[PDB]
Design a protein around this ligand. Structure first.
Ligand SMILES: [Cl-]
Ligand SMILES: [Cl-]
Lengths: 321, 321, 321, 321
């Protein structure tokens, strides 16, 4: 089991740099920085992180092919690869409708757009020239092949991730989810003459760890609420939950009733959409994920009540693997 | 007269950082970094430059509204403003069809596209929400109003710059060009109820300074050949140069005959398209630019035979103003 | 040689805007819209064209001092200049007795009227106050000097154009016409202390371009028929055509026998009153006009069998200049 | 009771378009744009407004028969009618001596001049040919009969408005004014075999609405000053005001002492020449106007301290009707 950790560039970058270095120091192998126009620039963040670290792999988790030309993305990743001396990773996903409407961007066929974006980035990152004539000149990747992970939350994306990516960042925290997802990724990989062993199945989980299991659960509630809000009914179906649970949280979060949403979050939901608790509790859960194909466990927001402490606690978990 | 300097991110960023720091040490107030998908990401470069400097203003010179959503650009710029404690600048221009063809981007209505991008960025950078509902959350500009400069090489762009920008980055090095351009910026400024005094007129010059005039001239020739090749007929007429000049250089460069191009660059062309020579020779030329309305002298490529050495020589020049 | 294009606002304004946009895209620098009380309002048309274009100059071609107070004309042009960001032009001619009889307007001293009109508009557009006390208040020109072109089809108008205008819109398509007309403009320019080089001599031609020279010629026949019907004796004399040619076509047209008029149009007439043929044929004819002092070639009605196609063909022609 | 709103084209047209769209969204059914040579062209303004709206009726309020030939006005209205798909209206008045003096136009027989102008325009707008031969050809009205409103501030104009118009735009804000005016309109309509029910009696009021009744009153004072300054003796007598009132303000404004004129405006004047206050206060006032025959309430300048806000407030008032 490999470990990754997520950070949202909504706090001072100098602070994020220190936290990533801490994560590196306790054993995390991957650092994933979210990419959203309303937060700090993901590449300016990653660049400063690269300077403050030495071995952890880092990249956007995930960017998308719409807010920036895939060529600009390839260039930003190659630039990061040079700064980090070969530690860049590239996570890319379809993005979200809310964002694109606010940016006046047409959200046309995400799968094929991602497919085309990756094809172009593969070419550019390889130092090659695309049929259209695009080619990197003043920047060059260090790695022979920078890994490209696809954020995949649906069947077509999962199959596609198997076919063209090196990893899948799946927004899920429970074994049952990967029991359903991995097979799709495998089907895609085989179709491409690849093996499921070639794809790093990353569990992009809602993570909250603390000595106080109660405090841990409380810091994750708001995150789990949005997760539920954004999940299709067949997902609540999979976890033995009410098919309309998501809609419920949708309305609360919609109004802006965060307090009510938090209060609506019970144990059945925490169990379905997050990995929360004490260090000891994380172990069997991560093992269960591993048994379902997860090869990378990503500690996602909120990480814990106190990030610095929680990363230290996660270090204990990593030492157990 | 204020001073700016250009750097192309096609060499190690650590080196660029050292060069901007040096430019800062000798009196430059602005650092302009080029932005092209085929070179290193301009924001990763700018972020590091900010970390390695303390008072110099810095920003892309220039980015464009097509390769990245202007909302991403605003975010990149606000992130830089935070990292730099309010020293960011934002230069933006139309871009070039060649690049966009390679990237599969349609180059629609450049003037209105830039005007719309700027309106959106003004709002986002001000911390406000756009009509479309876009708003910066995890990042906030330090400056109340981050300066936006427009690259303007035509009448419509110059008037627009006077109307909606805080400055115009004009690729011209001779007084006669500004004698013709400033009036248009002034028409725009006045149409917007502003004053020509509210616009920083920046001569984005081809600069080549060296103790050895001949060495300086030689280093700039290839740049002058490209400048001439991309110059519209009115520019030549204005300088008393054959109307065909641009097409001649265009063909010479197009067939890879760089020797011919360089050989065709004479005293007349150097005089019209660059500021080259010894420190003592720079003084009068820059004063002449100031008398035609230029408020910021930008030393652009190649800067000189040796950048580090030339930055120090420009330091002498700056001390003379 | 600069290129202009003429459109009659008797078809959807929406279509006209797109065609002007197309013209702008292929290189035309001027758009001229006719102004007749019986067609769509020229300014509503120009205002929408301004919204749908970016760089092409646009203006009425031509209006007159009788159907609207020159002050109203000044305001309409200044309004257009604001909307177009400094791209307005003002073509104004004496008008014609037919129209003014149908409108109950006394065609009093046309030369003095157009002269006094222009003086008033010059003052108003400059934002100054006339002796009579008129002054623009809620509208202001962007350009420091909006160009005023005079429709000049006779000696006194040509001399006056040279004396007080920035250009002359001459309804002629053959070099012999300008051979005779330019000297008159020159006389006026010199009488005013100006030079013929200060006046844009625009050939307001009957243009019809197409791959098929036969089809091109056929589309212009009806237009030529009318031009002939309205041409004075020295014109037919100049082109070695029967002195009664006008009266002839005048009767065929005055009886709705358009089929007859068209059939009565031969090569000698096509040669004397229009520029028709394939793109290859246009080049020499346009250069021939330029040799006679024409500085702006205006492609006038019908433009071609298919306006859209023809504008594209004229684009090829423009690329040759 | 129907609602109209007035805008003066002395601010960017794009802004006016949005304000009219807002007005349309909150229920206004008519938009009136003033027409003076010293402000932006009314038809270019109306054309862009038509583009940015869908149901509100729009037209000049009011134009006159002196600055443009009635035939030009007819085609301008017909053009607007096509652009808005049958939403054009036509307001016409006699104009003012001071304006025509400045334009060197002979202000003769206003009553018959308007009468003749309307007859001509009804013929042209109907697509028919005048006795003089004038006829629209390249433009055609959409509405079977475009409404023509006469600005009527006196007995003859009111009578005439009843006889030949479809509505009267009366510059008055108090019920007492319409008590005196409507009967004159009725007399004129009956004389023409028409019904007072056929004439839209529009109160072209000085309007100022705001949450703060004081702020509202303050924004309207300067407007009221001019109204009083231009009011005939019978009006002052009607509102128990000094016969000197008019000439007293006329003198102050003539001195350029607007601060004084404003300070001279008391509640008595506000009450006689405007509709100011909070939304709740407008309802009874508009009801009172309705009882006197007013069929359209026009919110004229200043509309309120902040137009956008005030339009929203008027939206509430409209909601009550
Ligand atoms: Cl970026
Ligand atoms: Cl008009």
């Amino acid at each position: 089991m490999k470990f990754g950790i997520e950070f949202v560039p909504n706090e001072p970058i100098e602070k994020i740099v220190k936290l990533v270095k801490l994560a590196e120091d306790v054993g995390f192998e991957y650092a994933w920085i979210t990419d959203h126009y309303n937060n700090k620039n993901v590449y300016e963040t990653l660049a400063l992180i690269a300077e403050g670290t030495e071995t952890i792999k880092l990249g956007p988790g995930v960017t998308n092919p719409y807010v920036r030309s895939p060529a600009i993305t390839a260039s930003a990743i190659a630039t990061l690869d040079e700064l980090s001396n070969g530690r860049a990773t590239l996570g890319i996903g379809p993005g979200d409708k809310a964002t694109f409407d606010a940016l006046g961007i047409e959200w046309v066929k995400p799968v094929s757009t991602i497919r085309d974006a990756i094809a172009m980035m593969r070419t550019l990152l390889a130092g090659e020239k695309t049929e259209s004539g695009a080619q990197l000149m003043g920047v060059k990747a260090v790695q022979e092949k920078i890994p490209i992970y696809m954020g995949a939350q649906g069947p077509m994306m999962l199959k596609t991730a198997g076919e063209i990516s090196d990893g899948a960042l799946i927004n899920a925290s429970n074994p049952k989810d990967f029991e359903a997802a991995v097979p799709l990724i495998k089907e895609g990989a085989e179709a491409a003459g690849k093996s499921i062993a070639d794809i790093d199945v990353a569990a992009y989980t809602c993570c909250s760890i603390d000595e106080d299991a109660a405090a841990a659960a409380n810091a994750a509630k708001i995150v789990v609420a949005f997760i539920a809000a954004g999940s299709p009914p067949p997902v609540f179906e999979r976890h033995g939950l009410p098919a309309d649970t998501g809609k419920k949280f949708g309305e609360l979060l919609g109004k802006g009733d965060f307090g009510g949403a938090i209060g609506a979050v019970d144990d059945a939901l925490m169990e379905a959409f997050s990995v929360v608790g004490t260090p000891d509790e994380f172990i069997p859960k991560i093992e269960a994920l591993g048994e379902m194909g997860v090869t990378q466990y990503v500690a996602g927001s909120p990480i814990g009540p106190d990030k610095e402490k929680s990363i230290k606690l996660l270090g204990e978990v990593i030492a157990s693997f």
